[PDB]
Automatic annotation (TrEMBL):
Belongs to the CRISPR-associated Csm3 family. Keywords: Antiviral defense, Endonuclease, Hydrolase, Metal-binding, Nuclease, RNA-binding, Zinc. One of its GO terms (biological process) is defense response to virus. This is CRISPR system Cms endoribonuclease Csm3. The keyword Protein biosynthesis does not apply. It comes from Methanopyrus kandleri (strain AV19 / DSM 6324 / JCM 9639 / NBRC 100938). Pfam families: RAMPs. GO terms for molecular function: endonuclease activity; hydrolase activity; metal ion binding; RNA binding. Zn(2+) binds at residues 84, 86, 113, 116.
Length: 335
């Protein structure tokens, strides 16, 4: 593998202001999904890591599906139109399943599923190895859409191969407002106030700390994962961290100042350390990445700064993608 982590560090800037929370009514009618909620502890609005991850996953899986022109029946299976889950999460699974495949599942790349391997999966949620479920009208699609990919008679064999849970390679830290956001942005607007345990709103320009941790598991999929992870963040930028019935809700920017890497080997000799954010990083960033001033420096093996790649304090998700060859070359994986 071997293991260890790559940590994205920066902040989320809102391009638009938002309400805090939702309502019983909107929740009932199936309308406004708003991830920005009140923190019982601090009393300030924040964006839970799980909500960011969920949103990034929901948008990426759709983009992945359409980019490969896959019919939703095939892509979502028994889940119909959302939450794609498959067990093709490691190359072993595909090699092991290849004998029973008439044709490659179209959402696969080099034998594995980017959606599920990155954002996790409960297993064979789409029911790829469960034709009985698929063909049932109430429990499935009323037919088997996977005929061309596998014989329904080989499903029970597949069911011992392709139905394995996978823990997500990415984890999002709860995004709380930065000190700048509390002392300046919130103060300038007179809202929101400290309301521990609407009619207050989160002003446009508000900034929430961004930490995203990616677990390196497969060196061969490292760069590809980073591309898709960044891409999912780009999608969240374009479509919002939340949504109403009609359009996106909560326009955001992911201002990513650095990629911070720690390999398993490095834990044996921590002293070979690059710190982030250091004082220099803080002077270079804020006012552009305000979260850095709230942070004490942490020890990493290698720190890739936006400043190393470009005359910038931060790069946006799509900008990191364009320079990923350059980035991965400097990381302690792939020799
Ligand atoms: Zn999948």
């Amino acid at each position: 593998g071997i293991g260890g982590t790559i940590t994205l560090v920066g902040e989320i800037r809102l391009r638009t202001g938002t309400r805090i929370g939702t309502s019983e009514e909107e929740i009932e009618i199936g309308g406004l999904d708003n991830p920005v909620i009140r923190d019982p502890v601090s009393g300030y609005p924040y964006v839970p890591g799980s909500s960011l991850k969920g949103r990034a996953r929901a948008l990426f899986e759709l983009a992945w599906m359409k980019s490969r022109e896959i019919e939703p029946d095939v892509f979502f299976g028994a889940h119909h139109n959302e939450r794609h889950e498959c067990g093709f999460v490691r190359r072993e699974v595909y090699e092991e399943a290849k004998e029973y495949l008439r044709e490659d599942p179209p959402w696969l790349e080099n034998g594995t599923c980017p959606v599920c391997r990155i954002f996790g999966s409960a297993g064979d949620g789409i029911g790829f190895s469960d034709p009985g479920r698929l063909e049932d009208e109430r429990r499935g699609l009323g037919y088997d859409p996977y005929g061309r990919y596998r014989d329904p008679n080989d499903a029970q064999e597949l069911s011992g191969v392709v139905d394995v849970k996978k823990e997500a390679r990415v984890a999002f830290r709860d995004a709380h407002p930065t000190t700048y956001t509390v002392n300046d942005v919130f103060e300038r607007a007179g809202e929101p106030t400290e309301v521990k345990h609407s009619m207050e709103r989160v002003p446009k320009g508000s900034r929430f700390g961004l930490e995203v941790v990616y677990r390196v598991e497969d060196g061969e999929e490292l760069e590809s994962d980073l591309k898709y992870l960044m891409s999912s963040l780009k999608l969240v930028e374009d479509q919002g961290i939340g949504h109403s019935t009609s359009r996106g809700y909560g326009r955001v920017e992911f201002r990513i100042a650095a990629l911070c890497a720690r390999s398993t080997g490095w834990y044996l000799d921590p002293g070979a350390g690059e710190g982030f954010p250091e004082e220099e990083d803080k002077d270079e960033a804020a006012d552009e990445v305000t979260y850095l001033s709230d942070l004490e420096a942490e020890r990493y093996e290698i720190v890739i700064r936006a400043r190393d790649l470009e005359d910038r304090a931060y790069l946006r998700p799509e900008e990191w993608v364009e320079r990923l060859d350059e980035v991965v070359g400097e990381l302690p994986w792939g020799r």
